[PDB]
Design a binder for this molecule. Sequence first.
Ligand SMILES: OC[C@@H]1O[C@@H](OC[C@@H]2NC[C@H](O)[C@H]2O)[C@H](O)[C@H]1O
Ligand SMILES: [Mn+2]
Ligand SMILES: [Mn+2]
Ligand SMILES: [Mn+2]
Ligand SMILES: [Mn+2]
Ligand SMILES: [Mn+2]
Length: 359
Amino acid sequence: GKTFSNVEIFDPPTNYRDPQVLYARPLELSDGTLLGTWENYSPEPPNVWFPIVKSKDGGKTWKEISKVKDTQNNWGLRYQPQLYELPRAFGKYPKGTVLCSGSSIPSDLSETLIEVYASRDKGYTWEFVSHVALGGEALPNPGLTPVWEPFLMTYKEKLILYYSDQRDNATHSQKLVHQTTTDLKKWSKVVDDTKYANYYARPGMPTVAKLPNNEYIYVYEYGGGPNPPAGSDYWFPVYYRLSKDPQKFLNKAHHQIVSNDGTTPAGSPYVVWTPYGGKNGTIVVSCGTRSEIFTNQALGDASAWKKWDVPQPTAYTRSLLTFQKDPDLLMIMGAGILPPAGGKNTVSASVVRLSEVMK
Ligand SMILES: OC[C@@H]1O[C@@H](OC[C@@H]2NC[C@H](O)[C@H]2O)[C@H](O)[C@H]1O
Ligand SMILES: [Mn+2]
Ligand SMILES: [Mn+2]
Ligand SMILES: [Mn+2]
Ligand SMILES: [Mn+2]
Ligand SMILES: [Mn+2]
C-alpha cells in the first residue's frame, strides 16, 4: 500500500531551541524519490542549516542525506526553506537540478536574505547560486523591513520567486511580491503581486498552483482581512486570486475561501493541484489553524470549496504534495506549531487518497 498516517520524519534533540522544528516542505523528484526539509533550530554554533531527508518508498521511511549550509554570510540558513525541481534548464542549471531557497539570517535576527542553493546530484551536495532579496530585521512587526517565505514556480521561459516583503514600510506593513530570472543569477526588478491600501494589512505566505484551463491560482493569508471572528480585532483568512499570467496577480479580484458549511480557513496556507477528480482536477488547500483539507473541483469557483478530515494534525504552514504516478495520492507534511511549542514539535507526514478522503 501507498497510504499511511502520522509517520515521524524527525524528532529533535530536546535541547533544540523553541520551536525546535517548524516549516516542513516536501519535493518529488522525476525519479520518484522524495526529499524533505524544515527549519532546524539547533544550538549555535555551528550556524543553523536546512536538513535534507530522502525517502525511496513514497514517504514510509526517511534518512538524512545532506545539509544545505550558508557558505556566504557566516549567518546560517534559518527560516522558510522551499524545495523545487527544475522542469527545464535555466542557464547552466539543467532540468532536474534541485533548488533549495530560504532565508539566511544572523542569530540576532538583524537582517533577512533570501538565497537560492542548487543540487546537481539529486540532493546529496549543494552549491550557492545567488542572492535574491535582502531585507531588514526578522520580526513580523510593522515598520521593519524584512523579506520572507520564498516560493518557486516556472512560467514559460522564466523562473518566478514569490515572497513576502516589508520593505515598502511607509505604505504597507507587508505586501506580496516576486522577482524573475532566466539564468538563476540575475533577478528582475521587484513586481508587486498583492497589496492593500490599509497600511496595517499584512498579506503573506504566497503559494501557487497551475490549473488545467491555463490559469493559475495564487493563495495567501490576508492579514487584516475583513470580518475577524468574535473576540478578535485582526485575523489571517485564506484568500486567493486567479490569473492566466502568474506575473499579474496584482490586478485580479480576490476571493476568500469559505467551504459549503461556512468554515473560514485562516493562516499559513499551502495550495496544490492534482489531475485527480475529473476534467478540472482538484485544487487542494491546507491552512495552519485547522486539520482539514479544502478542495475545489470547479477551477476556483468561490461557491465550490469543500472541507474534508484527514489524519495529519494541524501545523503552521502545513504543506502538500501530489504524486506524479498516482494523482489520487496526497502527502500532507508538517513540523508543528509556532512557538511556544513546549518541546513537542516533530516533523511528520501522512499520505491519503482523495478517492477515500472525499466522501
Ligand atoms: O518561519 C519562522 C517564522 O517567521 C516569522 O514570521 C514571518 C511572518 N509570517 C507571516 C508573514 O507573511 C510574515 O511576516 C516568525 O517570527 C517566525 O516564527
Ligand atoms: Mn524520539
Ligand atoms: Mn520530541
Ligand atoms: Mn515530477
Ligand atoms: Mn473536522
Ligand atoms: Mn484503500
